């Protein structure tokens, strides 16, 4: 039932706080933690994210100024004081500072807050972590956190919302190093990872929404809407009785292939057929990969609002039959639909898409080409080795991420025969 | 006076069990608080000093959401708390988890609760076990329970009501794996199993009841009508199938191929009319559109056939309709008969449900080779995924070995050949 | 040696240490183990002042290290715009090719330094230059699905 939420670094705390803000309005919780809804459905699965109402959230950072950013926000006063774990100085975009030095000293004090929130759960389902892979704390300390949580709670589900770097949003040349060193950690220690790519979020804001200079607020509006969409079935009763573990078992055919490509419709800053085709469109994906360049292993589509269940059924069959070639034929009925009656804020009809496609390799090949470009000239490698880190961890990491790409292409060209 | 114990396992089993026990109450005139203002119905209901009629049933699930509905529904007062058993975490659609890890933490508690119901029985005949083939609990925990019940109650019979998976009715990708694994491991612990195909029940609700998109209540209300006709012989005075043992005798000539097909007619919308003759409702049983399992019996042979009539049915009218039917082929060395049974009690429907109350109905129970079509479909889905070893790590990660997937599939290959030899 | 100290000075950005070391006769074209000169280091770490002093005192603008990397390759890779502009004005070879077949334009393109891509193009960077794997910055723009870059390369 219960999920413990961990938010790490500046990106992690920003997207983290916008998540709590979005879902609190859906569940009718005001900033003081008091319920004010008009439906019993809002309070039925409140135990999942809230403690009796207070978010079951842990707030970590090495930079103490993000505490003040968090408290400043609309729902900043809702989080528990004891749950804030902060350092004296940030990681300066150094994954090694986050993973091996400053972060590793503070990491034990975080596990004591986790252990406190976890020991208070009726039956803990798992962990939800928000972070970026480009920085130092969220990527370096966060992956360390993941590692220590997995050794303490090996039977629990570990899920991440991981934001991938793009030069379009942060032109910091060390971020591909930080993302590659983290993707290596995520392949071994997460059950499910939602790959939110800042390149995709920038291309949607810039080209589709036409925002000339998008801010983190414009990017985070899509991350928050995606986060609400994918967690819908965990938070509301409907025709589906499921948790993070059932999602994992049916979404992950092979252990390492647990990187999901989420999408949302409609895109903001409508009929059922128009919503269905948009969900399988590259312009609605939160990862910059063309889904028509690969094949889907598994797909989950959560629809939200009042609509004809029959129209949702036939339109979803109409896609598969028309586009037989994009779905692997060796996983029978690999497209699952869930229709939830409660729509999101300011809309009467929404669709959320969760794909496990072989086209995700495009996102990884982008990060690898950048890593490689920098790693060949040995650029800034001293910043990392100076924090007590081996040079061969850079080669472990690249090698592992390159293996992942090979697996995806293996299963993309595999026939049923 | 021979008692029957019903075990309802997982979501599907509990939800169909709720539909059943509500319908038995309407048939026997028992109130939602267990009081009855008026032997036969005592096979299914024990009595308390206070005059309460308590179902002889156990509801089990590894997570409580479903059973909590029962603890606050119309029949909250019908079951004592101890008959409703729940864990805090489910098998997550994984047979291994329901059988080897999570299921082992609660099997003992469940056996104590069954032993409490059994010590209240003067002549326990056996158990009726309801479950999905697809769920982690429905598949894994049930197979664990069937193994243990063979040891602790070795001379008693076990009948099953199993829900076969259908893509139209919210199935999980791994349901073909769970289905094959539970079948393999239960094949020697069950005496007779009535499969219910969710695709069949779903097409009947659409075709015959005009429902645009059925939900589990619609499907379950129809299912419970079929289950009640099968169990009517055990809860009323009767000539045919009066004890669990007679089901094997009448329907199962060969022990491994113990999956009879059930057909029910007439299925009429409460909206829709005149009344159907005994001849017409009998003919409907041979129409493939009325079967609990999607298969063509005209592309197969019969090993056994039972017709169970309910309501205003004169025996001479049946003999005429059966005579017409002979003028459909049988297995080589088996007899070419029909066993008929008549209960003159009118068929009951849930007040304000989707089914129309009719004057006469029939349930035909047949054991036909055409049911192998259902196994062929499941095995094919298993083969496509297993060739690539898709999803297998979830199973081996929960105490299972890969060799078990192979034994199970071999057992199904051998069951497909058993149907082809017969 | 005075060259070893000069290299550390250029890397560390010490403007005054650089000037003092050269006054005492330090090898302005000294190299470290990898074949890097004070100009490469200065160019890698964004020390434009040192880049200027070195170019005025006999620094080989088109020097190469063990892998064929010139200062311009590195300034483009890390994305120091003013440093790219100074090197070009002082005779940096816009189309220099390293051991991987990479030009400074390939690197600007890969790292997404779009302002540098414009500056290199305006200074005669060859858009038709292919690397060891046969890819041009235009090809890289297709593979990575980067329409912002594709548009800059179509002129
Ligand atoms: N007819 C019918 N089918 C159902 C019902 N509930 C679930 N199913 C089917 O049963 C399968 C899913 O198994 P469940 O019973 O929900 O699972 P479970 O036994 O609780 O096991 P877990 O995996 O532990 O949740 C699918 O084929 C569903 O279509 C129901 O009430 N009626
Ligand atoms: C808690 O949230 C979810 C949990 C699950 C699923 C899902 O997608 C609708 C969810 O919403 C995102 C799910 C996913 C995909 C499946 O196959 C592709 C499947 O077999 C089955 C499912 C779900 N089962 C059904 C019948 O929809 C169970 C796991
Ligand atoms: N979309 C999004 N990206 C962000 C946000 N904050 C930081 N980033 C990205 O995260 C990376 C920097 O990570 P950061 O969290 O600031 O470092 P940390 O605080 O040490 O973990 C860069 O790729 C930034 O674009 C945010 O609020 N939203
Ligand atoms: Mg269940």
Q: Please give, one letter per residue, the 3-state secondary structure of B11-47.
A: HHHHHHHHHHHHHHHHHHCCCCCCECCCCHHHHCEEE
Shared domain for B243 and B203, answered yes or no, is yes
The number of domains in chain B is 3
Is B63 marked as binding a ligand? yes
Chain A residues in contact with chain B using a Cβ-Cβ cutoff of 8 Å: 1, 122-123, 239-241, 243, 245-246, 248-250, 252-255, 298, 308-310, 313, 329-334, 336, 411, 414, 416-417
> Closest to C145 (Cβ–Cβ): which among A173, A290, A373?
A290
CA–CA separation, A1 vs A6, rounded Å? 17
Shared domain for B64 and B146, answered yes or no, is yes
Shared domain for B362 and B393, answered yes or no, is no
B208 lines ligand 1 (CB under 6 A): no
Relative to the alpha carbon of A245, which ligand is closest?
A: 2
CA–CA separation, B388 vs B407, rounded Å? 17
The parent domain of residue B36 ranges over: 1-260
> Closest to A245 (Cβ–Cβ): which among B11, B92, B387?
B92
Which tokens go with B270? 């409460």
The parent domain of residue C19 ranges over: 1-155
Report the residue of chain B nearest A154, measured CA to CA.
Answer: B397
The CATH code for residues A254-359 is 3.30.1330.20
Yes or no, beta carbons of C44 and A369 under 8 Å apart:
no
A192 and A160 Cβ atoms separated by less than 8 Å = yes
Q: What is the CATH number of the domain that holds C62?
A: 1.25.40.20
Min distance B269 CA to chain A CA atoms (Å) = 20
B91 lines ligand 1 (CB under 6 A): yes
Give the β-pairing of A124-132 and A2-8.
parallel
| Structure determination technique employed | X-ray
Which residue, B310, B311, B308, B263, is CA-closest to B287? Answer: B263
Task: Fold for A1-253, please state it.
Answer: Rossmann fold (3.40.50)
Residue A307 CB coordination number (10 Å): 18
Q: What is the CATH number of the domain that holds B327?
A: 3.30.1330.20
Which tokens go with B71? 């603890």
CA–CA separation, A371 vs B266, rounded Å? 69
C3 and C22 Cβ atoms separated by less than 8 Å = no
| Contact residues of ligand 2, CB 6 A cut-off | A 233-234, 240, 242, 246-247, 250-251, 298-300, 302, 334-336, 338, 354; B 170, 172-173
B266 lines ligand 1 (CB under 6 A): no
Residues of C in contact with A366 (CB under 8 A): 144
Shared domain for B320 and B185, answered yes or no, is no
The number of domains in chain C is 1
CA–CA separation, A282 vs A285, rounded Å? 5
Selected for mutation to probe chain A from B391, B396, B399 (highest A CB count within 10 Å) is B391
A300 and A348 Cβ atoms separated by less than 8 Å = no
CA–CA separation, B394 vs B154, rounded Å? 33
Shared domain for B358 and B379, answered yes or no, is no
Shared domain for B128 and B195, answered yes or no, is yes
Backbone angles phi, psi at A324, to 5 degrees: -60, -40
Residues of B in contact with A416 (CB under 8 A): 384, 387
Residues of A in contact with B386 (CB under 8 A): none
Relative to the alpha carbon of B131, which ligand is closest?
A: 1
Give the β-pairing of A192-197 and A259-265.
parallel
CA–CA separation, A96 vs A62, rounded Å? 13
A92 and A136 Cβ atoms separated by less than 8 Å = yes
Is B283 marked as binding a ligand? no
Shared domain for B92 and B196, answered yes or no, is yes
Which tokens go with A40? 């019993």
Q: Give the list of residues 6+ apart from residue A85 with CB closer than 8 angstroms, or none.
A: A58, A59, A60, A61, A106, A109, A110, A113
Min distance C100 CA to chain A CA atoms (Å) = 9
Shared domain for B268 and B297, answered yes or no, is yes
CA–CA separation, A12 vs B15, rounded Å? 42
Shared domain for B195 and B307, answered yes or no, is no
Residues of C in contact with A362 (CB under 8 A): 145
Q: What element of type H or E holds C120?
A: helix C114-122
Q: Which residues pair with A246 in a beta bridge?
A: none
Nearest CA to ligand 1 atom 14: B135
3-state secondary structure chain B: CCCEEEEEEHHHHHHHHHHHHHHHHHHHCCCCCCECCCCHHHHCEEECCCCEEEECEEEEECCCHHHHHHCCCCCCCCCCHHHEEECCCCCCCCHHHHHHHHHHHCHHHHHHHHHHHHHCCCCCCEEEEEEECCCHHHHHHHHHHHHHHHHHCCCCEEEEEEEECCCCCCCCCCHHHHHHHHHHHHCCCCCEEEEEEHHHHHHHHHHCCCCCCCCHHHHHHHHHHHHHHHHHHHHCCCCCCCCHHHHHHHHCCCCCCCCCEEEEECCCECCCCCCCCHHHHHHHHHCHHHECCCCCHHHCCEEEEEEEEEECCCHHHHHHHHHHHHCCCECCCCCCCCEEEEECCCCCCCCCCCECCCCEEEEEEEEEHHHHHHHHHHHHHHHHHHHCCCCHHHHHCCCCCHHHHHHHHHHHHHHHHHHHHC
CA–CA separation, A404 vs A399, rounded Å? 9
The strands making up A2-8's β-sheet, listed across from edge to edge, are A84-86, A57-61, A2-8, A124-132, A157-164, A192-197, A259-265, A349-357, A296-305, A335-340
* Domain extent listing, chain A: 1-253, 254-359, 360-417
Which of A114-142 are b and which e, b meaning 16 or more Cβ less than 10 Å from the residue's Cβ? beebbeebeebbbbbbbbbbbbbbbbbbb
Min distance C29 CA to chain A CA atoms (Å) = 19
Which residue, A185, A202, A90, is CA-closest to A145? Answer: A185
Is A361 marked as binding a ligand? no
Min distance A173 CA to chain C CA atoms (Å) = 6
Nearest CA to ligand 1 atom 6: B12
- Annotated catalytic residue: which of B3, B82, B175, B246? B246
Is A192 marked as binding a ligand? no
Burial of C21 (0-12, 13-18, 19+ CB in 10 A): buried
Our measurement of the distance from residue B147's CA atom to the centroid of its chain's CA atoms, rounded to an integer in Å, reads 19
> Closest to C77 (Cβ–Cβ): which among A288, A369, A373?
A373
Homologous superfamily of A360-417 in CATH? Helix hairpin bin (1.10.287.600)
Yes or no, beta carbons of B88 and A246 under 8 Å apart:
no
- Do B and A touch, 3+ Cβ pairs within 8 Å? The answer is yes
- Known catalytic membership, residue B246: yes
Domain end point (choices B207, B237, B260): B260
The ligand 1 atom at the shortest distance from the C-alpha of residue B93 is: 23
Q: What is the CATH number of the domain that holds B166?
A: 3.40.50.1440
Shared domain for B364 and B411, answered yes or no, is no
Residues of C in contact with A261 (CB under 8 A): none
Relative to the alpha carbon of B93, which ligand is closest?
A: 1
């Amino acid at each position: 039932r219960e999920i413990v939420h961990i938010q790490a670094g500046q990106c992690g705390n920003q997207i983290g706080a916008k998540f709590w803000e979005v879902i609190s309005d859906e569940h009718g919780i005001d900033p003081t933690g008091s319920y004010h809804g008009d439906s019993d459905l809002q309070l039925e699965r409140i135990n999942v994210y809230y403690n009796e109402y207070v978010p079951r959230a842990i707030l970590v950072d090495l930079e103490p100024g993000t505490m003040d950013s968090v408290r400043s926000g609309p729902f900043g006063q809702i989080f528990r004081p004891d749950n804030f774990v902060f350092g004296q100085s940030g990681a300066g975009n150094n994954w090694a500072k986050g993973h091996y030095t400053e972060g590793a000293e503070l990491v034990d004090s975080v596990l004591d807050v986790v252990r406190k929130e976890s020991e208070s759960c009726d039956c803990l389902q798992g962990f939800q972590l928000t972070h970026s892979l480009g920085g130092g704390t969220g990527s370096g300390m966060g992956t360390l956190l993941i590692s220590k949580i997995r050794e303490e709670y090996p039977d629990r589900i570990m899920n991440t919302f991981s934001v991938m770097p793009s030069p379009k949003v942060s032109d910091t040349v060390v971020e591909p190093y930080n993302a590659t060193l983290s993707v290596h950690q995520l392949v071994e220690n997460t059950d499910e990872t939602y790959c939110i790519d800042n390149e995709a979020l920038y291309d949607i804001c810039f080209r589709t929404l036409k925002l000339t200079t998008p801010t983190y607020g414009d990017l985070n509006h899509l991350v928050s809407a995606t986060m609400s969409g994918v967690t819908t079935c965990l938070r509301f009763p409907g025709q589906l009785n499921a948790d993070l573990r059932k999602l994992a078992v049916n979404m992950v055919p092979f252990p390492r292939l647990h990187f999901f490509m989420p999408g949302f419709a409609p895109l903001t800053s409508l009929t059922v057929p128009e919503l269905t085709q948009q969900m399988f469109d590259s312009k609605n994906m939160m990862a910059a990969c063309d889904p028509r360049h690969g094949r889907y292993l598994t797909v989950a589509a959560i629809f939200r609002g009042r609509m004809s269940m029959k129209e949702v059924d036939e339109q979803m069959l109409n896609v598969q039959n028309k586009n037989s070639s994009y779905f692997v034929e060796w996983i029978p009925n690999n497209v699952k639909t869930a229709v939830c009656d409660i729509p999101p804020r300011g809309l009467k009809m929404s669709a959320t898409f969760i794909g496990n496609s072989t086209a995700i390799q495009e996102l990884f090949k982008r990060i690898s080409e950048q890593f490689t470009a920098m790693f060949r000239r040995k650029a800034f490698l001293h910043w990392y080795t100076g924090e007590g880190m081996d040079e061969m961890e850079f080669t472990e990491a690249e090698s592992n991420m390159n293996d992942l790409v090979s697996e995806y292409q293996q299963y993309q060209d595999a026939t049923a025969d | 006076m021979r008692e029957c114990i019903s075990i309802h396992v997982g979501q599907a089993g509990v939800q169909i069990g709720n539909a059943c026990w509500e319908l038995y109450c309407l048939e026997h005139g028992i109130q939602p608080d267990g009081q009855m203002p008026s032997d036969s119905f005592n096979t299914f209901f024990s009595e308390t000093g206070a005059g309460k009629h308590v179902p002889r049933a156990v509801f089990v699930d590894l997570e409580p959401t479903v059973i909590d509905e029962v603890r606050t529904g119309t029949y909250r007062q019908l079951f004592h708390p101890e008959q409703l058993i729940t864990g805090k975490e489910d098998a997550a659609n994984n047979y291994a988890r329901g059988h080897y890890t999570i299921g082992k933490e609660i099997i003992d508690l469940v056996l104590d609760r069954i032993r409490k119901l059994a010590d209240q029985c003067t002549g326990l005949q056996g158990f009726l076990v309801f479950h999905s083939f697809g769920g982690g609990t429905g598949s894994g925990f049930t197979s664990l329970l069937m193994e243990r019940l063979s040891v602790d109650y070795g001379k008693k019979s076990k009948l099953e009501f199993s829900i076969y998976p259908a893509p139209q009715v919210s199935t999980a990708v791994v349901e073909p794996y769970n289905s094959i694994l539970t079948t393999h491991t239960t094949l020697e612990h069950s005496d007779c199993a009535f499969m219910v195909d969710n695709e069949a029940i779903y097409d009947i609700c659409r075709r015959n009841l005009d429902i645009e998109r059925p939900t589990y209540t619609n499907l379950n209300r129809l299912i419970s009508q079929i289950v009640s006709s099968i169990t009517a012989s055990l809860r009323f005075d009767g000539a045919l199938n009066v004890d669990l043992t007679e089901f094997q005798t009448n329907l199962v000539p060969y022990p491994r191929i113990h999956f009879p097909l059930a057909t029910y007619a007439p299925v009429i919308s409460a909206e829709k009319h005149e009344q159907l003759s005994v001849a017409e409702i009998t003919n409907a049983c041979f129409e493939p559109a009325n079967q609990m399992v999607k298969c063509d019996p005209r592309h197969g042979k019969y090993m056994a056939c039972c017709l169970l009539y309910r309501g205003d049915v004169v025996p001479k009218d049946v003999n005429a309709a059966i005579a017409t039917i002979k003028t459909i082929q049988f297995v080589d060395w088996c007899p070419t008969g029909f066993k008929v049974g008549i209960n003159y009690q009118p068929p009951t429907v849930v007040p304000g449900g989707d089914l129309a109350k009719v004057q006469r109905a029939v349930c035909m129970l047949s054991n036909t080779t055409a049911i192998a079509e259902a196994w062929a479909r499941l095995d094919h889905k298993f083969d496509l995924m297993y060739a690539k070893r898709a999803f297998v790590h979830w199973y081996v990660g929960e105490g299972m070995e890969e060799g078990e997937f192979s034994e199970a599939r071999e057992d199904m290959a051998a069951l497909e050949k058993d149907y082809e030899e017969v | 040696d005075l060259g070893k100290k000069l290299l550390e000075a250029a890397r560390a950005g010490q403007d005054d240490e650089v000037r003092i070391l050269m006054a005492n006769g330090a090898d302005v074209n000294a190299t470290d183990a990898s074949g890097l000169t004070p100009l490469h280091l200065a160019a890698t770490y964004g020390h434009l002042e040192i880049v200027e002093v070195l170019l005025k005192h006999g620094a080989d603008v088109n020097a190469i290290d063990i892998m064929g990397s010139t200062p311009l390759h590195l300034a483009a890779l890390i994305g120091h715009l003013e440093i790219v502009e100074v090197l070009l004005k002082h005779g940096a070879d816009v189309n220099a090719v390293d051991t991987w077949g990479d030009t400074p334009l390939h690197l600007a393109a890969i790292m997404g330094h779009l302002e540098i891509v414009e500056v290199l193009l305006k200074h005669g960077a060859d858009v038709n230059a292919q690397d060891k794997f046969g890819k041009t910055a235009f090809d890289i723009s297709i593979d990575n699905g980067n329409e912002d870059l594709a548009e800059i390369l179509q002129k």
